[PDB]
Amino acid sequence: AAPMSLAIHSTTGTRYDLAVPPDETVEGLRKRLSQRLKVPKERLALLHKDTRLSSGKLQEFGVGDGSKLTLVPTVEAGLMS
Amino acid sequence: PAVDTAEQVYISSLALLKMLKHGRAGVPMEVMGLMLGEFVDDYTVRVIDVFAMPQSGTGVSVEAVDPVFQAKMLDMLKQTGRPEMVVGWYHSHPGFGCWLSGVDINTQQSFEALSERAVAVVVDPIQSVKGKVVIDAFRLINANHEPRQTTSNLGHLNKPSIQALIHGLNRHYYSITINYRKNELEQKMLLNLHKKSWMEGLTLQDYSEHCKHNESVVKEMLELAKNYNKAVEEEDKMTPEQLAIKNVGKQDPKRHLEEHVDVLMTSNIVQCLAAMLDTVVFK
Amino acid sequence: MVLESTMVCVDNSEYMRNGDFLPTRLQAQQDAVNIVCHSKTRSNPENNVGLITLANDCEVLTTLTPDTGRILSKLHTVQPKGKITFCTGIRVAHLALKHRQGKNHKMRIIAFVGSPVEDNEKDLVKLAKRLKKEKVNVDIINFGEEEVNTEKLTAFVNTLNGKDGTGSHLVTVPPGPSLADALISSPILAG
Amino acid sequence: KQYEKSENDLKALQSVGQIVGEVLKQLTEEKFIVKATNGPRYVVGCRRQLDKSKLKPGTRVALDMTTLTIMRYLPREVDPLVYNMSHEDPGNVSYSEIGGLSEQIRELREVIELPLTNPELFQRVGIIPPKGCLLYGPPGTGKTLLARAVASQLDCNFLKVVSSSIVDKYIGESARLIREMFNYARDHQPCIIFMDEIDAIGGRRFSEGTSADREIQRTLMELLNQMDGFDTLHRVKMIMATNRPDTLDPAL
Amino acid sequence: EFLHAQEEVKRIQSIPLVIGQFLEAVDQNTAIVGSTTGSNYYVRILSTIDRELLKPNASVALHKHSNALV
Amino acid sequence: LNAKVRLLREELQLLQEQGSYVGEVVRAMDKKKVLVKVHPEGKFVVDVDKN
Amino acid sequence: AVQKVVVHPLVLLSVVDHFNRIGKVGNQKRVVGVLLGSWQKKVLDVSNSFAVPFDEDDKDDSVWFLDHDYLENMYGMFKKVNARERIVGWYHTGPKLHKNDIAINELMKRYCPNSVLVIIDVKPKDLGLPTEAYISVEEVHDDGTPTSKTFEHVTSEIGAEEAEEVGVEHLLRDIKDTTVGTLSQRITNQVHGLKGLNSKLLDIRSYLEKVATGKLPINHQIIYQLQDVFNLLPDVSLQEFVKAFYLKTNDQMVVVYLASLIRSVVALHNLINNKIANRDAEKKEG
Amino acid sequence: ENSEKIKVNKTLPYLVSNVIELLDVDPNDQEEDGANIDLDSQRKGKCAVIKTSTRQTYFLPVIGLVDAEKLKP
Amino acid sequence: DKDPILRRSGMYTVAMAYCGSGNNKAIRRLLHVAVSDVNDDVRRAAVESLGFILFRTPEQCPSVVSLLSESYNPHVRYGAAMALGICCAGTGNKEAINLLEPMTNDPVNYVRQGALIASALIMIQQTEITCPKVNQFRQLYSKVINDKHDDVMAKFGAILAQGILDAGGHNVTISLQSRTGHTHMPSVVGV
Numbered sequence A: 001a002a003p004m005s006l007a008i009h010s011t012t013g014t015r016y017d018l019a020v021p022p023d024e025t026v027e028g029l030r031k032r033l034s035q036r037l038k039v040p041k042e043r044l045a046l047l048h049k050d051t052r053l054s055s056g057k058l059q060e061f062g063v064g065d066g067s068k069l070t071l072v073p074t075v076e077a078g079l080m081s
Numbered sequence B: 001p002a003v004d005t006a007e008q009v010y011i012s013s014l015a016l017l018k019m020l021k022h023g024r025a026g027v028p029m030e031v032m033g034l035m036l037g038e039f040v041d042d043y044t045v046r047v048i049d050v051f052a053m054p055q056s057g058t059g060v061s062v063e064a065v066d067p068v069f070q071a072k073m074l075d076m077l078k079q080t081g082r083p084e085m086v087v088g089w090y091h092s093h094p095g096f097g098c099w100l101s102g103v104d105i106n107t108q109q110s111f112e113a114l115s116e117r118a119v120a121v122v123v124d125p126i127q128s129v130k131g132k133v134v135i136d137a138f139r140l141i142n143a144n145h146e147p148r149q150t151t152s153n154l155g156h157l158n159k160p161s162i163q164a165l166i167h168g169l170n171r172h173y174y175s176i177t178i179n180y181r182k183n184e185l186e187q188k189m190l191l192n193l194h195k196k197s198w199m200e201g202l203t204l205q206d207y208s209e210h211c212k213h214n215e216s217v218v219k220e221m222l223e224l225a226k227n228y229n230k231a232v233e234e235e236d237k238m239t240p241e242q243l244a245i246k247n248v249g250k251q252d253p254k255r256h257l258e259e260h261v262d263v264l265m266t267s268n269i270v271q272c273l274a275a276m277l278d279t280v281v282f283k
Numbered sequence C: 001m002v003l004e005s006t007m008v009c010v011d012n013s014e015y016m017r018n019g020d021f022l023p024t025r026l027q028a029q030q031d032a033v034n035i036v037c038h039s040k041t042r043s044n045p046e047n048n049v050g051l052i053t054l055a056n057d058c059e060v061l062t063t064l065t066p067d068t069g070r071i072l073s074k075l076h077t078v079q080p081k082g083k084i085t086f087c088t089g090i091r092v093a094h095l096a097l098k099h100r101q102g103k104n105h106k107m108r109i110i111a112f113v114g115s116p117v118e119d120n121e122k123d124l125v126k127l128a129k130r131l132k133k134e135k136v137n138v139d140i141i142n143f144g145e146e147e148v149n150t151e152k153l154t155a156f157v158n159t160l161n162g163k164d165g166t167g168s169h170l171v172t173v174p175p176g177p178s179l180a181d182a183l184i185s186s187p188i189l190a191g
Numbered sequence D: 001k002q003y004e005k006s007e008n009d010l011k012a013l014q015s016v017g018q019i020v021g022e023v024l025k026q027l028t029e030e031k032f033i034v035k036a037t038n039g040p041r042y043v044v045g046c047r048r049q050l051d052k053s054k055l056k057p058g059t060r061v062a063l064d065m066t067t068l069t070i071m072r073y074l075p076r077e078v079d080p081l082v083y084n085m086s087h088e089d090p091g092n093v094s095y096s097e098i099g100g101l102s103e104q105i106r107e108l109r110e111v112i113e114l115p116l117t118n119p120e121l122f123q124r125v126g127i128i129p130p131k132g133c134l135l136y137g138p139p140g141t142g143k144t145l146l147a148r149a150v151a152s153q154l155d156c157n158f159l160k161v162v163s164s165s166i167v168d169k170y171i172g173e174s175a176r177l178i179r180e181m182f183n184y185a186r187d188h189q190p191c192i193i194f195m196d197e198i199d200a201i202g203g204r205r206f207s208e209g210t211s212a213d214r215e216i217q218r219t220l221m222e223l224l225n226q227m228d229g230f231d232t233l234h235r236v237k238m239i240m241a242t243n244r245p246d247t248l249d250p251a252l
Numbered sequence E: 001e002f003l004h005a006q007e008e009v010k011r012i013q014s015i016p017l018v019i020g021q022f023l024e025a026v027d028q029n030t031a032i033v034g035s036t037t038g039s040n041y042y043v044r045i046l047s048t049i050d051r052e053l054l055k056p057n058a059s060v061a062l063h064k065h066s067n068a069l070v
Numbered sequence F: 001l002n003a004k005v006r007l008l009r010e011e012l013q014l015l016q017e018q019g020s021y022v023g024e025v026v027r028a029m030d031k032k033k034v035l036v037k038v039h040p041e042g043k044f045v046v047d048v049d050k051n
Numbered sequence G: 001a002v003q004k005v006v007v008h009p010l011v012l013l014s015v016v017d018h019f020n021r022i023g024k025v026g027n028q029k030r031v032v033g034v035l036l037g038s039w040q041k042k043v044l045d046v047s048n049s050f051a052v053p054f055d056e057d058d059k060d061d062s063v064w065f066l067d068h069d070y071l072e073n074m075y076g077m078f079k080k081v082n083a084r085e086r087i088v089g090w091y092h093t094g095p096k097l098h099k100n101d102i103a104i105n106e107l108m109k110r111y112c113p114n115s116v117l118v119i120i121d122v123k124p125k126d127l128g129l130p131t132e133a134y135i136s137v138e139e140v141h142d143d144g145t146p147t148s149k150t151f152e153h154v155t156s157e158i159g160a161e162e163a164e165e166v167g168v169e170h171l172l173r174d175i176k177d178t179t180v181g182t183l184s185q186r187i188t189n190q191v192h193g194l195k196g197l198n199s200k201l202l203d204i205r206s207y208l209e210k211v212a213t214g215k216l217p218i219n220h221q222i223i224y225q226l227q228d229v230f231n232l233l234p235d236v237s238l239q240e241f242v243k244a245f246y247l248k249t250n251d252q253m254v255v256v257y258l259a260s261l262i263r264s265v266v267a268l269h270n271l272i273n274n275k276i277a278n279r280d281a282e283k284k285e286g
Numbered sequence H: 001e002n003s004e005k006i007k008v009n010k011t012l013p014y015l016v017s018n019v020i021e022l023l024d025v026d027p028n029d030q031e032e033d034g035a036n037i038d039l040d041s042q043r044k045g046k047c048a049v050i051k052t053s054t055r056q057t058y059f060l061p062v063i064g065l066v067d068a069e070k071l072k073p
Numbered sequence I: 001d002k003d004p005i006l007r008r009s010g011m012y013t014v015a016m017a018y019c020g021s022g023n024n025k026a027i028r029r030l031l032h033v034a035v036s037d038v039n040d041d042v043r044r045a046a047v048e049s050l051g052f053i054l055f056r057t058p059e060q061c062p063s064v065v066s067l068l069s070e071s072y073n074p075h076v077r078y079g080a081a082m083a084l085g086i087c088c089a090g091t092g093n094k095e096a097i098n099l100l101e102p103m104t105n106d107p108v109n110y111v112r113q114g115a116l117i118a119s120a121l122i123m124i125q126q127t128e129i130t131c132p133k134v135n136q137f138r139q140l141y142s143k144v145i146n147d148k149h150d151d152v153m154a155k156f157g158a159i160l161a162q163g164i165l166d167a168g169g170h171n172v173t174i175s176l177q178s179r180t181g182h183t184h185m186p187s188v189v190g191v
């Protein structure tokens, strides 16, 4: 198995540390975090070394084990939409 | 498991000024930013600073464009002595009062999911005037009972506004009292802001201009005295109700005479006293 | 694996004109700091290294940055001039790596002394004890060979790592025209 | 491409319009008096990063729907009627297609074209070039053909209108349209205004008549004050064609 | 405190106001104003307003909702 | 002075109450109703307050 | 050459916040940072600022460190957030000029050629403005010979936008006393001016005492300026000056007397009206 | 899903209007981030001015779901 | 002091120090703070302390708190209510009840709450013959408690007033001074 444990820092401060398969994709990681936080997956935004993680596998982005990630929620205001 | 109504959100002077300046800059839009602070106890949410973030949107919505900026800013503030982390977000409602809309509630839901006690602050720039600033702090109510427990009168001192009640106050979210605790240096700097240079106090005023102003005001007072004589003859041939509407669209010689007297007295007394003080101080 | 914030103290003095150590001591030291920065980066990807010169008084060129391209690029245009101020340079480096980006990192100073040091023994030992209290390691390279000995430097390093501290170092290189990178093997691996 | 179009459509759906108004006066730095075309007048703010020197008393402006803030300044509006006037298609008639009219072509050109190419001659002589011409004659002689030839072969802006088409049932709208047409000409100098069949609205002003007659005479008075009144026209020329020159106002 | 209150009542002078026309004064603290929307109203006058300036048929700004002479 | 200050403090919420239409009375009629022309709108058959 | 520097209140409060946070961290005495702003044809406007890492040895005036890499990064981010603001100078809360200030200014001149220093005393034991503005200039002497880089004073004042003014006035519910009349025209000046003049003269006296005793060497330029001051001190016993003073005072007192007469007549009118009202009310009640 | 969103946002009741103009607008200058508006700037295409049947004029920074070149005054 | 809470403690210490002394200096300070301070809590405490200071001459507390009760500041109005209550506890003062009656229907809920509690404190144990408004105030408390569209804090005050009016069964009274004329420390602290 060799789970890949990655630290997930949040701007607020809370740490949602979790371990994923070595082949886990960014979409899967976002889905797991959304399931944990009860937030739609489109709101959350994962970061890595000052670059947003768009989509694909985690490995080819340089995400190994013991790598720090940041979770920045989207901030939206308005009257509609 | 309580969340009490005596809880307060402490907004620093710097945070308040930054919020108001950004909101006024973005007058048609709901410009927005993050609030940094600490969760001291269950009766305090200290807001010590706020920083705006790159955002773009229309007059109907505003959204942030990059989270890399937020992360990097947090890091580079920690590196200079602000380890505080995000405790909420602020956005401006220009003229609609203070309340949260649906998109605002969704954003606050995300922030609550991240941290339980995160708060949202709505500052309305244009409705703010010199003496008072229109600002409020909010948090959501789950799908349940009473949202909070009352162990004091501190919560029930604000008389929530009709606009907020219409838009969902006490039904989808509740308010939190805002307090403006300050430190000694902040107090001293705020007091010193308006202090003028010492030389300005002793500086005199061109005597030609002073005499010209005195002459102009006395000449005006002459005509005002004529009109005052005319007006005094009235007030006996006037209905008790007619007197009030008598001074509508027409000059009031008594009021203008009093104002001119006050201005003349102040100016002349100040000038004479300054002249004597200088006469002694400077040899 | 070990986190380390290592500030490099390069010597752009007038004695670096000397061609005794390969194509000019300036270029020899350029290659040396190249290998040292690459070694630190390879040892830890998160490790951060900076650059300071020991010119007339001092000059900080690049504070701690994880990348090395900027440090190497700034290394160009380091034309020699003036004397060397070891105490002031090391104090400035101490301040710079006291104002770290990450406080869990360790603190290190790699100094290239390619010119005589005019600081007495008493001041250098005082600096040694202060740095020992502050928990700094000082790897000193006796480059240049203007004295190629314990030119008030072995006392410095021994005072640093006294009582089997084995934290500091003093690699003394002979004038042998061999690449300074080729010569350095103690601090890079057996630190 | 289909998904790009769908995304663009979804993005465009969530966009709100902006009220269009006119600036009447600037009270302070961040306070303007704006008159929405609907009729009401508001005191409104202005977006910060906006060149407020360009919000003169009369500039069209786009207002935010909610806060009524000034968000943009726009060029003067061109009525669809005036746009249609300017965008007529007189074929491609050339001066060779007109026969028997050489002196008349020469005179019409001297009035309209020559002052728009060689003003120096008129400046040297010391005369302001003439403005308007009246093409009158029996039917089928070539007045509209001459107008079409001028429009097709000349490079200035052209405005073709029918005096019968200028008229509107509501009170004052004919005069309003004449004013808009001449404002369009003034803005897009140089311009030629061709009022075909002028006798429809230009007729002798009677003393005894009807409400419709007086409305048409008001339209004619507006036209006359536009052609020669308190404001000179400069680089705007006029051509009018009529089969009945006798039944025209001496003022016209 | 009176000086403070005068400055705090000016938030009723928010920017998006409606221009009107002041027709007649009824009691003081009240008046009849003709809005540009085409309707007349019996509205209250703000206390801070200088009544010397309320000449007949003088331009005034009214609250968008309450239509109060502000 | 205190009364002046109190009035100026409640005036902010007193000024958000809706104005009143001004109409021209045509003729009284019926139990207590009146016929009024609310310009520019049409006429209405309105009541009368008890006072 | 700068004719005036306008420092907005947000800059001052941000400086105070920086000082407080670094002090809470501990072991520091002075704080340093950048002053973003804009130019208005020789009338500066300082609108925003950000902190910058800075340390110095309390003994050596040559061991100081400023993180210019961090300065550049934070300036890039601040530009990304607000383009209209560009680096204009640096600030430090040190009560008075230090000896490293010219070196720091030379460092900052590589980011702003006309850098302006603003010293903000966060603990002002005085009666005056909290900002002092200085600009680096080359000074050529006649006997001091070597041309050194010295700091030249520039007028500094505090201004504010509308939002900043509103916020400051809202926050100023600490001690509010407007009294724009003679009371304020007596406290904000007269007393304050005399106290400040006494402070400046006491500083000059302290320096002169030090020079006379021998702690400090003689400065010919300071002595020359003092000579000019003592020469400018006017003479108030001249007959012409006394006569002019009396004439102007008589005119001012004429105007004052007329104003007082108007006041008295108005007071009498009010008394008559009040008595009429009370008599009428008593009659009606009877 | 996007087509469903478009259909649900195209609720049937429309308001007829006439296209008064098809203006061309361009960005003016740099707009500070934090407060930048996608309409006043960052809009380089064609914008429409319309007059609703209710006698209300309007500026349309985004024309909508109908391509600009088709519309004429 | 700069902290409003510290200033409030200052007002409270003035009260406790000059408890039942009728000290003109203390009354002067309290009134100055009440009419000057910037913090409404401090104003409230300053107005409240007058009851402790003047509890030995109940006929005088109305003479100083009537105008404060009729004020523009609801906090000062509440302070006047509680000051009358503390000054005239267990006294059934006609002037105190007359001052409190208009305030029982004040616009502000906490002002109403304070008025109700003060009225209960004053009219403890008093009968119809002794005080001609006890029954009226009892009915007022019942009405406030029963109304289902009234403020929760007004209901809190009404319930507390019911409790205080009939205390210890009906066999207890509140008096800040013993029957011999000595200040009752337990009662002062309790109030």
Ligand SMILES: Nc1ncnc2c1ncn2[C@@H]1O[C@H](COP(=O)(O)OP(=O)(O)O)[C@@H](O)[C@H]1O
Binding pocket: D097, D098, D099, D100, D101, D138, D139, D140, D141, D142, D143, D144, D145, D146
């Ligand atoms: N002189 C002319 N030369 C050529 N064609 C002419 C001439 N006069 C009239 N026509 C014909 O008449 C038509 C246009 O009528 P025109 O004479 O221009 O207006 P009007 O009949 O009102 O004077 C054209 O189709 C053209 O063939």
Ligand SMILES: [Zn+2]
Binding pocket: A077, A078, A079, B030, B091, B093, B099, B100, B101, B104
């Ligand atoms: Zn919102």
